[PDB]
Structure formats: C-alpha cells, structure tokens
Fold:
Amino acid sequence: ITEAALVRDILYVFQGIDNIKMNCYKVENLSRSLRDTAVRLSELGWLHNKIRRYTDQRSLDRSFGLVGQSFCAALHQELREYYRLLSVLHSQLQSLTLRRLLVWTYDPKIRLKTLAALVDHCQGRKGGELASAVHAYTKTGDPYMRSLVQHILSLVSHPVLSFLYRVASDP
Amino acid sequence: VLLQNLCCRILGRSEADVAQQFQYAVRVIGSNFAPTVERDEFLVAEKIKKELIRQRREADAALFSELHRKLHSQGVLKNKWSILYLLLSL
Amino acid sequence: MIHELLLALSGYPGSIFTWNKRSGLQVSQDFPFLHPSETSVLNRLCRLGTDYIRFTEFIEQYTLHGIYLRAFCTGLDSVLQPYRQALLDLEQEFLGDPHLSISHVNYFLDQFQLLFPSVMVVVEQIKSQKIHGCQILETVYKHSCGGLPPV
Amino acid sequence: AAAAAANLNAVRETMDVLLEISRILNTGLDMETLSICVRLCEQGINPEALSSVIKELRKATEALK
Amino acid sequence: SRTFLVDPNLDLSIRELVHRILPVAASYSAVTRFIEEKSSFEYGQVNHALAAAMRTLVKEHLILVSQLEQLHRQGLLSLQKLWFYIQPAMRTMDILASLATSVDKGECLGGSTLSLLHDRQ
Structure:
C-alpha cells in the first residue's frame, strides 16, 4: 500500500466518510510507522462526527427553542471554514505527505476539540439555560479558546437580548 | 545588461543618467550570485500561506494553493523556488 | 461525471443517479471507476436534489386553489433563484482547472444544504392540512420567527 | 503555430496570479516591474540580495523627489 | 524518560551517532505530553497560557521536520548532515523539556508557576 493512497483516504476520514474504516478509525499490509500516524489523523475526523450529529439531530425537532437555533446555526459558520480547509488540502493531493499534514492540521485539532466538547457540556439545556452553559466556558484563560467561545456567546445571547429589549412565562 | 534594465524600471531614467546606483547594484549582486540555502518550493509555500493567514485573509491563503499548482501544470519555469522567495520578501 | 452530476442536481435523473418516486434521488450501486467511499457523500448530496425536484414538481402542479397559493409558488421560485445561479457557476470553475474533485463540488453547496431542510416542512404543512385562503400568511409567519439567519 | 500560442496563454495566467499574491501582500510592485523580478528569479538569484536592492532604490528615489 | 531500541545487528559506526540524535526525540515526547495534560482547567489560568505559548514552538518543530523530508527526496540528506541541521532544535526542545519536568515535579499552579519562569539564546 503506497503512502499516497493513505493521503487519499485520510482526506475523506476528516469528514466521516471512510482502507480506513470506522470508536477509533481502525485502519486495516503497511509498515507500523504509517498506521500510527493515520490513527491520530483519522480520529480528528471522528470528532467532526460528534459535532455534526448534534447540529443534525437538533435541527430536526421544532421544540428546541429560539436560543437553541442561534447555537445550532452558529456551529455551522464554524464548519464552513472547516470545509474550506478540506478544499485547499484536496487541490494539492494531485505534493503533501503524512508528516506534512500534521503541521497543516495541528490548529484545527483544537477548534474541533473545544466545539466537540462544547456540545456535550450543554446537552439538555434549552432556552436561556443554554446561553448560561456556553458562558461557563469563558473562564478558561487560554487566549485561543477564550476568544473563540466568547464569540459563540455573542451569537447565542442575541435572542436572549431580544426578549429583554422587548423569565418563565405562564400560558 | 539585464541588471541595468531594472535600474531603469524602478528609477525612471536612461542608462546614461543613472550610473551611480548601477555601480551599487553590481557590488551587491556580484560576489553574492550563488544561492546560499538549499532550494525547496515546499517550505517557501508554507510560509506564504502562514503569512496570508496572519492577516485574517484566510480566503487568499487557499487561492494561492490553486495558483501554485498551475505553475507546475504549464512547466515553463525552471527555478520556482527563487521567484517565490523574492515575491514573498517584497 | 461532474457535468453528469450537475444535471442530476438540476432535476434530470439518469442511469448513474436513478430516481424513485418514494425515497428520492440516490446512487444506484458501486461503480468501479470511482472510489467506494464516495458512494456516501453523493447520497448526502442527493438529500438536496430530492428537495429541488419535489419543489419544482409542486411549483408546476400548483397544488387546493386560491390566489394566495398561486403567489406563494410565484414567490417560492424567487428564493430558489440563488440555488440555480450558484449551480451554473460550478461548471465554470470545473471548465477552468480539471483537478477539482467532488469534495470541492460538495463544499460549494454549503448554504443550500442547511436551508432547503427547514423550508421543506413549510410546504409539507400546506399539502397535508389543506391550508386554504389567507391563513397561509400566518402559517408562513409562524415559521418566520425561526433562529436560523438564512431562513 | 499552436504550441507557441498555448505557452503565451499559460504565462499570462501565471503573471496574473502572481499579481494577486502581490496585492494581498501589499508589495508596492506593479505589473511592469513585477515581470522584471520574475525573470531574474528564473536564472537563479538570491532573493535576500535582490530584495535589498529594491529596498534601496525605492529608498533613494525619495531623496531626489 | 523514554527509552529506545536500535538494532542487534547494525554497524557500530552508526549506533554511536544514532544515540546522539535521539535526545531531541525523548526531550520531545515529554513536551507534547505536557501540552495535552496541563491544558485541563483544574490547573489555573497560568498553566494554560504557559501550555499555549509552549505550543507555537512545537509547530515550528514540525515544519523543521517537513523541510528535511522534502530535502531527503533529492538524496542531499546524509546522516552526518542530519546531526548538524537539528542543532537549533536540540537546544530549544532541551529547554522546554526541563520546564515541563520542573513545573510538574512540585505541583505548581498560579503564581508559583510564574516564579519558576523567572528563576529559570
């Protein structure tokens, strides 16, 4: 199995579409130096699933509220960009290798680390209680995360400040 | 003779006029002709993307990747490292 | 195959992209020339084509009657215009460089993939409850207070 | 004939893309000057040396203006 | 604290030089494990920004390995030539592999992690 063939499948495992198959993306031959680097790279694609399932399962039911939409519709502007990176990486496959990917995808291994762990801390929260559980992620100090989550808060807290400028009501 | 056209493009003059600068350009170019670092277009590419990303211009960092491939597609350029190493510096 | 797909996403099904009256657009089976991993993203891509076909079939059928239903379809094509225009563009980009894969084509739809789904049940509520008369100007309005900015 | 016109097209493309990388990087170069610096870099020349020259002739054209 | 194994049947004129390159890897397998752990919130707002600013150097160490493989394809990379290229990396990844082992020895968080960076090219 050539190294180029692995570079062909990995660019798909970054999305969910599976040599590399589906919780770790167990790869199934080739030398040990190749399987190890694929394993870590393939697993980044698995994260992308956990963040995609939420923005697809909750984009189905109509009883998630008005805040749960501006959150589920702010996890997409932070995904189109992840679809622009996959665009660029594919144009060069026609040269890049495994050890060259690690530096390319070292940063989106973190943004896909906060978002894939921001949708688990707020699972059953709807309404304002969700805008209060994506604010408990700002007390972090890490200048790269505190400047990412402090942007999703600026979108999730827009509907809340829409009622206010216009608290449980009773029908 | 080609270095003198450059001194006439940047400075707007004729070769009979500007000859002190062209005396300074032969001093620098000459004795510094041979390339001093190993040549690879890969490293110079990953530094023009890292630079356009640093200016919040993430859209042109993925457009360059499509313009750098076309250079290889046509194939009239022998030293692609040099001309990129220079365009990055300016 | 690219120009083959860009027609399948337009409303014309063929041998590669069969059409079923119940399920919707979908790929027939495995193809040797292409990889066996793409058979998924296309199926993810067709979930969009099925929407446009079921849209334009309803738009033409006009079905129920009333001006407020005529005008709704008359307007329904206007919101659907950027979809077509953004599809004509894909061919131009592929006409330039012949190194673009389905990945980039799938990436280009982006906005249409998260819009059609939310604007699909609005049609379904009409054809399933016989919403006759000016009552449409509320059934569409009750869904206008949605969170999704694009919608 | 033809292969002599297909090369003049693949060069006007690349000379148009390098002009895009030139403006998003805000180099003061223009389409005429940039074609000189590309030709030089084809023969093989230190861009650390050639850029010191341009950073100097542009630094002396002001003392005369 | 990583241990390595080379070969039972190898030229002695190589193994003595291999053991001169590895101390940049063992000093690296203890920095990348310091990042993936001291990033946990339960460590203060200082042991975080220390792990972030300690990550940009790891990025520049991954570029230095990329430019070597691309230079390895043309065969211009002999083993003797390698021992000289990584010298800037053998000094930097020797500094960070000493802070990341002296901040975790005595559990530090907050100010006591800002003192150690003031006592320690």
